[PDB]
UniProtKB/Swiss-Prot annotation, chain A:
Cell compartments where the protein resides: Nucleus, Nucleolus
Span list, region Disordered: 1-23
Gene designation: nop16
Originating organism: Schizosaccharomyces pombe (strain 972 / ATCC 24843) (Fission yeast)
Subunit structure: Component of the pre-66S ribosomal particle.
Role: Involved in the biogenesis of the 60S ribosomal subunit.
Keywords: Nucleus, Ribonucleoprotein, Ribosome biogenesis, rRNA processing
Entry protein name: Nucleolar protein 16
UniProtKB/Swiss-Prot annotation, chain B:
GO MF, one annotated term: RNA binding
Keywords from the named record: Cytoplasm, Phosphoprotein, Ribonucleoprotein, Ribosomal protein
One GO process term, biological-process aspect: cytoplasmic translation
Functional description taken from the UniProt entry: Component of the ribosome, a large ribonucleoprotein complex responsible for the synthesis of proteins in the cell. The small ribosomal subunit (SSU) binds messenger RNAs (mRNAs) and translates the encoded message by selecting cognate aminoacyl-transfer RNA (tRNA) molecules. The large subunit (LSU) contains the ribosomal catalytic site termed the peptidyl transferase center (PTC), which catalyzes the formation of peptide bonds, thereby polymerizing the amino acids delivered by tRNAs into a polypeptide chain.
Protein name: Large ribosomal subunit protein eL13
Keyword field contains Nucleotide-binding: no
GO cellular component: cytosol; cytosolic large ribosomal subunit; preribosome
Compartments (UniProt record): Cytoplasm
Swiss-Prot record, chain C:
SUPFAM superfamilies associated with the record: Ribosomal proteins S24e, L23 and L15e
GO cellular-component term (any): nucleus
Protein name per Swiss-Prot or TrEMBL: Large ribosomal subunit protein eL15A
UniProt region (Disordered), positions on chain: 134-153
Gene responsible for this protein: rpl15
PROSITE patterns on file: RIBOSOMAL_L15E
Pfam families linked: Ribosomal_L15e (PF00827)
Note: There are 2 genes for eL15 in S.pombe.
UniProtKB/Swiss-Prot annotation, chain D:
Species assigned in the record: Schizosaccharomyces pombe (strain 972 / ATCC 24843)
Alphabetized SUPFAM superfamilies for the sequence: Ribosomal protein L29 (L29p) (SSF46561)
Function: Component of the ribosome, a large ribonucleoprotein complex responsible for the synthesis of proteins in the cell. The small ribosomal subunit (SSU) binds messenger RNAs (mRNAs) and translates the encoded message by selecting cognate aminoacyl-transfer RNA (tRNA) molecules. The large subunit (LSU) contains the ribosomal catalytic site termed the peptidyl transferase center (PTC), which catalyzes the formation of peptide bonds, thereby polymerizing the amino acids delivered by tRNAs into a polypeptide chain.
Domain of life of the native organism: Eukaryota
InterPro entries from the UniProt entry: Ribosomal_uL29, Ribosomal_uL29_CS, Ribosomal_uL29_euk, Ribosomal_uL29_sf
The protein's name: Large ribosomal subunit protein uL29
Molecular-function GO terms, alphabetical: mRNA binding; structural constituent of ribosome
Length: 161, 116, 166, 121, 164
RNA sequence: GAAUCAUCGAAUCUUUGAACGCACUGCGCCUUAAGGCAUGCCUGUUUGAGUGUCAU
RNA sequence: AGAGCAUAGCUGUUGGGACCCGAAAGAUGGUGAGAACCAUCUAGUAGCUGGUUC
RNA sequence: AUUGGAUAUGCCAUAUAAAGCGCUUUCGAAGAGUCGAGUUGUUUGCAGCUCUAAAUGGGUGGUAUCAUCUAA
RNA sequence: UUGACCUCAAAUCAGGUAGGACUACGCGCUGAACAAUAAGCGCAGGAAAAGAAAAUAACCAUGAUUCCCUCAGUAACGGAGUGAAGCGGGAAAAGCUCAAAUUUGAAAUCUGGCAACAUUUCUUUUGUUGUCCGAGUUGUAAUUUCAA
């Protein structure tokens, strides 16, 4: 009806048709590979999370859930410790096993000293002993960078390993 | 001026697809963040427990989660709210601790330079 | 810092030093054009606290508007039209006399690479900020249209919402 | 007619008088046809018009490619060599400066990135 | 109009002789040029790259926020204020702040000379906080001259409304 | 390689019009038929002037 | 020793252009040259006129 | 054929660096012709005009001191 | 005489940008009759605007914004009429950046030219490295934003 739409109707040129209309279609999973492998492309996201043994929401649900079958004291809260929780399904066990095995592999958190760091701490140790770090930091000539006792202690600890 | 609701079923479906599109992006983690439990601010509703906005800094400190890492693991922070009673502190610290008991945090890769 | 002294001195708006300077500078500003470029802000404390940085891409323009709508809002829109390639950032009162009120506007060039590479002013480059002074999105524009938080500060009521099942 | 693929395999100044000869041929044939011609006459008008169009296409493409090569890795190039997507697209922030962050934001994301996690049921 | 005493004090500047002696000491303490700093840093870089303790640098102090901070901390020994700062409010409080802190101060002529010392186009104010042991006597002599030629002199017109 | 065909990333796209050398097709200018020659503004470059302030 | 709540239909009634139609307002913005003409607010109206279907 | 986020694995990594969480015989800056007061309009807001601030101050509430907030 | 700085200039100098159109839905300045309406004017985007409390409340307190339901055709104003909001239930959720404190043991910052090296939705797009100049101490980085 609009003159623009009448203009393109009267033209002999084809329309810029695009076919993107498919409802009932749910987004495919990218990101986690374990989830994608075990995902059910037909089931909803709640049905998939429950089957995989995950929580789709850490809070309440704001409606009625689907029922398919006829089913048959401050001290002891801030100080108690809960020993994690069981993995209900196999999918969660794969996620847990993968997490611990990657954390063990990427666990080297000890920094070795460099050439400058080694010489810096060596000059301080060979003059002010080994157990006295406060006197090491209070030196002005050898400790030119003015590192405090904690940093010199860390330089010692990293030198050992 | 009349506001019709012929798109009410369409909006229901559009929001469902947003939930699924979000879950497609973040595969194993919940589509919502954990909300605290608070009390409505009036004599009519103060006996009810509802969901809050985020956890106070004193709640996070007691549970052992620093405010800088709380957001990274899906724990909202409310700098505005405060714990005026020891009951609200205990109700939401336990909520955080139960949340951390059920949490699998996948490790991240870190850059370790060869030298010191 | 010397901006604590400038901020405190600007409160004594008609002391001996401030009244003499306002009288002297008003005479000079009336000699120049209505809208003229300022080599540097006359209030380096006030411009600094309103977002201005002494770097390329930041432009200061002075303007006088007759006394007797908001005067600051009128200064912002006229200067923004004058240099239409720039984005109006903020504005501030610098002087006034019996006839005129003088304002300086801070404008930002959204095409300069020192502006487009600064993440703190990168936001102004986006086209949603084209002529903020014309839509009331500056500080005085927001204040002029009652935008604020509290009880101090229609279409959805004049409608009749008719649900499907009603 | 002429083949476009082997037309590009010729020298530039060769295409010059080939266009010249084709243009006089079209003009001469038009002079012949206005005094009386058959239905085939307008058939070779159509072919020679497209042949001239094919000829001029090769000259312009070859010249354009030469200009692109001459201005490769130059800070400023003529507007006809520049991109033409949309006026707004040209004015937009480039992805490099779109992704610029302060050192405050770099440290935040270096030490506290959004973790990947899961909630057991 | 009638110039207020706070603005009228900037019309009386340090005389020719004492200003000449002031900039003679200052020119011994100019900050390292961008070029000279680069050569010194790459020299240390070559030492670091091949194989590898200094002293605290001595220079004049510039910048308005920096100098006002030094005056408030009583770290400054001599403050020289440009007499032609275009918005005068940037330095109109400086003589009084130097009086409150008991810092010797003077108002030297024009800002181009001050900027030239620090390798800039313009310096509204310069301050001297530390000198080498051999320049202690030269700085002390200038402080006396500044006091005798700027503080002992005037001190009565700076309370009077100038101009008109 | 047909197509009054489809796709479409390369080329071309008369005079106008925000319309831009001045009038509105004439009338022009400069440089080498071609290249050009609107206005405001921003960053920089270069050439000048000033009884501006200072140093020699 | 509670009788209500919800939905549907019917009827009445009050608003919306409100059974249809019939007099020019007035205002806003333009065109042409005081007056004229054009387009929207505007379904601004007729205590009434005429009509209102097996 | 284009590109998303990840994963795995090499090569580099300017770390003499940069962070979170402990502790304090040490400190802790906070936006003015603006708030506000008086008077005229539009609609408490906004604006003009005359005047013009403060630092545990200032705003807004419950008290009819307390609570809450931290503007330009 | 020369130089530094400032100011005023000029240039068919180099590199950029603005206008106009569409406006269903944004946001402004306005504005009749009869509605904070029509019309007029200005300015945008795929959304806009708003937005991390100078917010509520008087409770066992809540906690940026927006939208829906409810509150409620209620309070209030003024009998008629106009007519909200706090709470409550949902949708979605994300937080932050500066000014103001000396880097002062070192303007640590940035644009541009030139020269190489890459890179491309792309010979059309983006950068990186080096050098020189300029910006900048009348303040560019790092650090801090009261939740500290």
């Amino acid at each position: 009806a609009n003159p623009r739409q009448r203009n393109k109707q009267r033209s002999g040129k084809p329309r810029l048709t695009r076919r993107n209309a498919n409802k009932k279609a749910k987004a495919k999973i990218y990101g986690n590979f374990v989830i994608q492998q075990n995902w059910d492309k037909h089931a909803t996201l709640r049905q998939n999370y429950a089957r995989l043994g995950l929580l789709a929401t850490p809070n309440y649900v704001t409606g009625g859930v689907e029922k398919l079958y006829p089913d048959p004291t401050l001290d002891d809260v801030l100080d108690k410790e809960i020993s994690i929780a069981p993995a209900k399904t196999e999918v969660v066990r794969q996620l847990e096993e993968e997490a611990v095995k990657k954390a063990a592999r990427q666990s080297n958190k000890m920094l070795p000293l460099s050439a400058f760091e080694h010489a810096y701490i060596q000059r301080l140790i060979n003059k002010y002993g080994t157990e006295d770090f406060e006197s090491m930091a209070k030196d002005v000539k050898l400790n030119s960078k003015l590192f405090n006792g904690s940093k010199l202690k860390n330089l010692y600890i990293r030198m050992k390993a | 001026y009349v506001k019709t609701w012929f798109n009410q079923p369409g909006r229901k479906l559009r929001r469902r697809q947003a939930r699924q599109t979000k879950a497609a992006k973040i595969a194993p983690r919940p589509v919502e963040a954990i909300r605290p439990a608070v009390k409505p601010p009036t004599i009519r509703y103060n006996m009810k427990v509802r969901a809050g906005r985020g956890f106070t800094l004193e709640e996070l400190k007691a549970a052992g989660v620093s405010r800088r890492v709380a957001s990274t693991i899906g724990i909202p922070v409310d700098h505005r709210r405060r714990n005026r009673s020891e009951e609200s502190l205990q109700r939401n610290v336990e909520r955080i601790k139960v949340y951390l008991a059920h949490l699998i945090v996948f490790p991240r890769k870190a850059g370790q330079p060869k030298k010191g | 810092g010397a901006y604590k002294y400038l901020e405190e001195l600007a409160k004594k708006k008609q002391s001996d030093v401030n009244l003499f300077l306002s009288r002297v500078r008003a005479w000079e500003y009336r000699q120049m054009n209505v809208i003229h470029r300022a080599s540097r802000p006359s209030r380096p404390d006030k411009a600094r606290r309103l977002g201005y940085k002494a770097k390329q891409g930041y432009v200061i323009y002075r303007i006088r508007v007759r006394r007797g709508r908001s005067a600051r809002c009128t200064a912002e829109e006229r200067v923004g039209r004058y240099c239409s390639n720039l984005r109006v950032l903020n504005s501030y009162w610098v002087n006034q006399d019996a006839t005129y009120k003088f304002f300086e506007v801070i404008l930002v060039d959204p095409s300069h690479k020192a502006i487009r590479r600064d993440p703190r002013i990168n936001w102004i480059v986006n086209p949603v900020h084209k002529h903020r002074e014309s839509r009331g999105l500056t500080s005085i524009g927001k204040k002029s249209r009652g935008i604020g938080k509290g009880h101090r500060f229609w279409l959805r009521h004049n409608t009749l919402s008719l649900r499907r099942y009603r | 007619a002429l083949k476009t693929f082997e037309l590009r395999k010729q020298s530039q100044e060769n295409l010059a008088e080939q266009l010249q000869e084709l243009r006089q041929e079209l003009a001469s044939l038009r002079v012949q046809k206005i005094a009386g011609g058959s239905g085939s006459k307008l058939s070779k008008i159509k072919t020679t018009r497209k042949d001239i169009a094919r000829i001029l296409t090769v000259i312009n493409e070859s010249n354009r490619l030469a200009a692109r090569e001459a201005y490769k890795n130059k800070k400023y190039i003529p507007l006809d060599l520049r991109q033409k997507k949309t006026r707004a697209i040209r004015r937009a922030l480039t992805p490099y400066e779109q992704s610029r962050k302060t050192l405050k934001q770099i440290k935040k994301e270096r030490y506290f990135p959004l973790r990947k996690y899961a909630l057991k049921a | 109009l009638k110039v207020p005493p706070a603005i009228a004090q900037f019309q009386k500047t340090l005389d020719k002789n004492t200003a000449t002696q002031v900039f003679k000491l200052l020119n011994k303490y100019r900050p390292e040029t961008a070029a000279e700093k680069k050569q010194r840093l790459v020299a240390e870089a070559e030492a670091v790259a091949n194989g590898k303790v200094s002293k605290k640098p001595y220079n004049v102090k510039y910048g308005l926020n920096h100098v006002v901070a030094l005056i408030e901390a009583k770290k400054a020994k001599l403050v020289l204020i440009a007499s032609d700062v275009d918005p005068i409010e940037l330095v109109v409080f400086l003589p009084a702040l130097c009086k409150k802190m008991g810092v010797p101060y003077a108002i030297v002529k024009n800002k181009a000379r001050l900027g030239t010392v620090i390798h800039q186009k313009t310096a509204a104010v310069l301050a001297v906080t530390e000198v080498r042991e051999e320049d202690k006597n030269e700085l002390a002599s200038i402080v006396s001259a500044v006091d005798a030629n700027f503080s002992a002199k005037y001190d009565e017109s700076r309370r009077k409304w100038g101009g008109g």
